[PDB]
């Protein structure tokens, strides 16, 4: 069971990777109000720009 000593640094590396994912995910969500959408294309950008008008001018 001594070999569990070697699993601690690997566990730390895994937690580090989980942080690099989740911290950037939550900061983006807090700033934009919704999570990042994978595959934002021309259509989605045009939708957001037109939706700014359709919301604010209502």
């Amino acid at each position: 069971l001594v070999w569990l000593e070697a699993m601690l640094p690997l566990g730390i590396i895994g937690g580090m990777l989980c942080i690099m994912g989740n911290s950037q995910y939550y900061i983006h969500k807090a700033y934009h109000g919704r999570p990042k959408h994978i595959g934002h294309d021309e259509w989605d950008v045009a939708m957001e720009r037109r939706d700014k008008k359709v919301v604010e001018k209502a």
């Binding site: 934002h40 294309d41 021309e42 950008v45």
Partner: protein
């Protein structure tokens, strides 16, 4: 859209700053070997091969059989060149 490239630039700026901080804080307290040219040439050729592979790989669904065989002919020419290099000893470093 090119919007997604802006975070990459800001990331580069921050990574550069981290590099300067780490490197700068301790300042406070005649034998030409042709085989390298030859390996450079081979890398150039296969670099262009990968370059031409990229659009083909994303376009296979639209170009169908004609595009497949045209790329096959391209590869046949380049692979004849590769066979020539292999036979001539360009791939041997001994």
């Amino acid at each position: 859209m090119m919007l997604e490239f802006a975070p990459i630039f800001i990331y580069l700026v921050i990574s550069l700053l981290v590099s300067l901080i780490l490197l700068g804080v301790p300042f406070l307290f005649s034998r030409f070997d042709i085989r390298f040219y030859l390996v450079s040439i081979l890398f150039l050729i296969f670099d262009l091969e990968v370059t031409f592979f990229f659009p083909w790989a994303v376009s296979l669904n639209k170009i169908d059989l004609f595009g497949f065989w045209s790329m096959m002919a391209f590869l046949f020419i380049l692979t004849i060149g590769f066979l020539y290099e292999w036979k001539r000893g360009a791939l041997d470093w001994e």
